[PDB]
Amino acid sequence: GMSISSKAKEILTQFTREVWSEGNIEASDKYIAPKYTVLHDPGDPWEGRELDVAGYKERVKTLRAAFPDQCFDIQGLFADGDAVVMTWLWTATHKEDIPGFPSTGKQIKMSGATVYYFDGNRLTGHWQITDRLGVYQQLRQAA
């Protein structure tokens, strides 16, 4: 593939904003490559899978539905070669019922790091770690 363009960081920033923070699922069409691989993403149902844009959008829909007002707050962008690593904080209201923890309305906070791989301006996959234990713990204190 092509590796990054000069605008990789700006692209991730907009993509994260539009798709992930604002839930503009269809904006994925502007950012996702024809093949997108969830290279690593602990507990992600799509981990290890190669998705097409449609499949990618379905995953966004599932993840967004869990915390519909979720917002990613990019902390750092670290570009190297065909990748840009994004570190981020995340906030969402616990307002949807999830397994064992019904909607409490409290703020859930998480942080994560995501290596995004590029083919030009398009994302080909991610390698991600998030503070799921932190969320798990916060949900325990909520209920």
Side-chain angles (χ1 to χ4, degrees), residues 1-34 36-105 107-143:
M2 295 193 294
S3 195
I4 64 167
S5 83
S6 64
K7 294 191 175 302
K9 290 186 184 186
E10 287 159 294
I11 288 161
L12 276 188
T13 306
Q14 198 189 30
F15 154 71
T16 299
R17 186 180 174 187
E18 293 179 349
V19 175
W20 288 96
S21 298
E22 295 167 4
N24 184 349
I25 307 305
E26 303 307 309
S28 303
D29 294 353
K30 302 184 290 186
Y31 302 113
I32 307 307
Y36 183 98
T37 302
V38 179
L39 297 161
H40 182 81
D41 200 344
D44 193 272
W46 296 267
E47 196 181 40
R49 295 189 60 196
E50 177 171 287
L51 301 177
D52 53 12
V53 172
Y56 184 87
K57 287 188 283 192
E58 294 301 328
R59 169 174 178 282
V60 185
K61 294 175 200 178
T62 287
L63 283 48
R64 285 277 303 167
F67 295 96
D69 74 353
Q70 67 188 268
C71 190
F72 289 77
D73 174 7
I74 296 174
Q75 300 302 107
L77 289 172
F78 309 91
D80 184 350
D82 69 347
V84 183
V85 184
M86 184 186 85
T87 52
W88 45 268
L89 301 179
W90 179 93
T91 60
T93 306
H94 179 212
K95 65 183 191 304
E96 288 285 355
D97 294 343
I98 49 177
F101 299 91
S103 59
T104 66
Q107 270 266 296
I108 300 299
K109 292 201 164 202
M110 183 172 77
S111 55
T114 308
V115 183
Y116 271 107
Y117 289 96
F118 285 78
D119 180 350
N121 287 0
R122 287 171 181 280
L123 303 177
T124 64
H126 73 260
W127 197 104
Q128 174 164 278
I129 309 289
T130 70
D131 184 21
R132 297 188 295 158
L133 183 58
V135 177
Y136 178 104
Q137 288 172 346
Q138 292 166 56
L139 292 168
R140 298 320 197 259
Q141 283 183 319

